[PDB]
Amino acid sequence: ARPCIPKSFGYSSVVCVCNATYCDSFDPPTFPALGTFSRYESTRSGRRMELSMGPIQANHTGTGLLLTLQPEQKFQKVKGFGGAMTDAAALNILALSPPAQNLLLKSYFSEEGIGYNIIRVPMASCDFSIRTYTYADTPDDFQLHNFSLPEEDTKLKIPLIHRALQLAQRPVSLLASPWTSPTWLKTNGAVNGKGSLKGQPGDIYHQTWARYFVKFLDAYAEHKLQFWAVTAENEPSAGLLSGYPFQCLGFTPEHQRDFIARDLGPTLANSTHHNVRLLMLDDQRLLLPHWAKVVLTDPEAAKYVHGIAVHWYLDFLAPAKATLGETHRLFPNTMLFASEACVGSKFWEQSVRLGSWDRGMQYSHSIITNLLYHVVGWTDWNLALNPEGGPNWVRNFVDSPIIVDITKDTFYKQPMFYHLGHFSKFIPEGSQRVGLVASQKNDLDAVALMHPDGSAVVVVLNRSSKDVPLTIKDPAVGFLETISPGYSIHTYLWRRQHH
Ligand SMILES: *[C@@H]1O[C@H](CO)[C@@H](O[C@@H]2O[C@H](CO)[C@@H](O)[C@H](O)[C@H]2NC(C)=O)[C@H](O)[C@H]1NC(C)=O
Ligand SMILES: *[C@@H]1O[C@H](CO)[C@@H](O[C@@H]2O[C@H](CO)[C@@H](O)[C@H](O)[C@H]2NC(C)=O)[C@H](O)[C@H]1NC(C)=O
Ligand SMILES: C=C(C)c1cccc([C@@H](N)CN(C)S(=O)(=O)c2cc(F)cc(F)c2)c1
Ligand SMILES: *[C@@H]1O[C@H](CO)[C@@H](O)[C@H](O)[C@H]1NC(C)=O
Numbered sequence: 001a002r003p004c005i006p007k008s009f010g011y012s013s014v015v016c017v018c019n020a021t022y023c024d025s026f027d028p029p030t031f032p033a034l035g036t037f038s039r040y041e042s043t044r045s046g047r048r049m050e051l052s053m054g055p056i057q058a059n060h061t062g063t064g065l066l067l068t069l070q071p072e073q074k075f076q077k078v079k080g081f082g083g084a085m086t087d088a089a090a091l092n093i094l095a096l097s098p099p100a101q102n103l104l105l106k107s108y109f110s111e112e113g114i115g116y117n118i119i120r121v122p123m124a125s126c127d128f129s130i131r132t133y134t135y136a137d138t139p140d141d142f143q144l145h146n147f148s149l150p151e152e153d154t155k156l157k158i159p160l161i162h163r164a165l166q167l168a169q170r171p172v173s174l175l176a177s178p179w180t181s182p183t184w185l186k187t188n189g190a191v192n193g194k195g196s197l198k199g200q201p202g203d204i205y206h207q208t209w210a211r212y213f214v215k216f217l218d219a220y221a222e223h224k225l226q227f228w229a230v231t232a233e234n235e236p237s238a239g240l241l242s243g244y245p246f247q248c249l250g251f252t253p254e255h256q257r258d259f260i261a262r263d264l265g266p267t268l269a270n271s272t273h274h275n276v277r278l279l280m281l282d283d284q285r286l287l288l289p290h291w292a293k294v295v296l297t298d299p300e301a302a303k304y305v306h307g308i309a310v311h312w313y314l315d316f317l318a319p320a321k322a323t324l325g326e327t328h329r330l331f332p333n334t335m336l337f338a339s340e341a342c343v344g345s346k347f348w349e350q351s352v353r354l355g356s357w358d359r360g361m362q363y364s365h366s367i368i369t370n371l372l373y374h375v376v377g378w379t380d381w382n383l384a385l386n387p388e389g390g391p392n393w394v395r396n397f398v399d400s401p402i403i404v405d406i407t408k409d410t411f412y413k414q415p416m417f418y419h420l421g422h423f424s425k426f427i428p429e430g431s432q433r434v435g436l437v438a439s440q441k442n443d444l445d446a447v448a449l450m451h452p453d454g455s456a457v458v459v460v461l462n463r464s465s466k467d468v469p470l471t472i473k474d475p476a477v478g479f480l481e482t483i484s485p486g487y488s489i490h491t492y493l494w495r496r497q498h499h
């Protein structure tokens with residue numbers, strides 16, 4: 001439709017520039033006819049999800065790298081992909097002119113963009129807020145008569161979510177997560193710092209907190225928004241830490257277990273929102289498998305927990321097999337879901353690196369990692385930030401796939417945007433990961449899935465500098481002869497028919 005207008009800021013690759021009159025976009029999605037494949041290619045050298053087509057061939061007589069699809073080796077079904085409508089994201093989006101706002105939202109949520117189908121919604125304030133508040137700051141309101149949504153919700157987040165839903169053809173799922181409770185429910189009486197709910201699960205404090213989730217869902221439902229899931233707390237481990245700088249609420253895994261079993265599970269199940277799924281953890285992966293063991297081996301907690309939400313701070317190393325792998329082995333029927341990821345959080349690295357191919361590769365490598373370890377979806381953090389990586393009331397700035405420069409009424413689509421889009425655009429909800437076997441050792445990262453309609457999608461990431469010729473074999477269908485250029489990412493799509 002409209003190509004990337006590239007701009008360099010001195011990092012390893014380019015951003016695509018959008019403004020009030022222009023943004024890069026795709027034509028309406030169509031599949032290549034049976035016997036043809038589509039390839040979307042992005043490269044450090046500047047290609048941005050460029051479409052080409054090739055033939056599927058009956059024969060192959062190379063001896064080089066062969067990737068054989070395993071369409072009958074089935075893994076997890078995919079929920080989807082998206083990002084977070086924080087106060088910071090909403091403020092940044094709405095600071096653009098109406099035309100630029102629309103082109104930003106279409107970039108993420110339209111079929112002429114990358115087809116996001118998940119939005120994570122903070123329950124009141126977090127670090128990516130400029131005001132500290134909860135929905136029930138009036139103290140000792142245990143029946144939550146004064147619970148209400150402030151303008152951050154009613155004027156900023158909710159209208160933007162509605163606009164996103166209008167632009168999407170794919171059903172969008174919302175996920176809610178709280179950072180802090182009202183301070184009068186907390187041992188330390190502050191939004192931040194070390195502190196937990198007062199008392200113990202099953203008591204008035206805990207019941208009030210569970211009821212606040214229902215009040216939140218009720219309030220959003222009054223605005224005609226329904227949630228797919230909630231998490232039991234954003235990063236519950238954070239509130240166990242002395243001096244924690246911003247909004248938090250500390251739970252040990254035992255506290256979370258008992259809160260879910262006694263309070264949050266029963267309260268949600270008793271409500272009109274009983275179909276909303278409950279995800280535990282919502283925290284970093286080295287807390288697994290221990291946290292899953294503590295919560296899910298209690299049958300009274302386990303019956304309320306639909307899944308385990310994981311956060312990915314891509315700046316930092318941690319094992320995958322020992323965390324996600326072991327958790328899936330122990331609890332295969334409890335889905336894993338990546339509810340937050342970000343990069344740029346180290347104080348000594350530039351929060352926003354406009355055009356960083358490396359940060360793009362961190363996004364796609366993380367997504368592939370997640371999908372190969374059974375994770376059913378992947379959710380970015382802030383949908384948009386300013387060039388400082390904000391706003392953020394504690395200056396905990398980070399990067400975002402879209403960076404807004406309001407002085408030019410312009411926004412920049414980072415490599416991260418395209419790396420995420422190589423997945424989000426091409427993996428409909430209900431797709432199933434399938435196997436993909438390499439004939440020889442190689443430097444590529446790849447994942448294969450099957451759409452609900454049986455079509456194939458393969459993503460190939462090359463983090464190496466070398467162009468790698470390869471062949472994809474679909475045993476039902478034939479061979480795709482291709483190349484994975486150095487510092488590229490490709491998505492391949494084709495129709496599958498059997499004979
Ligand atoms: C939005 O960005 C576009 C693309 O850069 C601007 O349009 C370009 O303007 C330059 C300078 O006149 C032309 O040489 C290009 O040919 C234009 N490109 C296209 C695709 O039209 C546009 O002026 C910007 N809009 C605003 C409101 O600033
Ligand atoms: C379970 O859900 C029902 C709502 O259907 C709750 O019943 C309401 O309780 C409030 C007081 O908390 C009353 O003022 C309403 O009149 C009740 N409504 C109905 C329709 O019965 C019930 O309290 C909930 N139980 C819990 C949370 O333990
Ligand atoms: C191209 C194919 C099909 C392929 C088959 C087997 C192995 C490989 C490896 N070169 C890389 N893998 C270990 S991986 O692709 O399985 C992988 C990549 C990732 F980004 C995160 C991860 F945990 C595993 C490639
Ligand atoms: C494919 O393979 C066999 C090799 O013997 C041959 O019969 C056939 O003509 C080849 N070429 C094509 C285009 O199918």
Ligand SMILES: [K+]
Pocket residue numbers: 134135136137138146147148149
């Ligand atoms: K209030």
Ligand SMILES: [K+]
Pocket residue numbers: 344345346347348349350351352397398
């Ligand atoms: K930083």
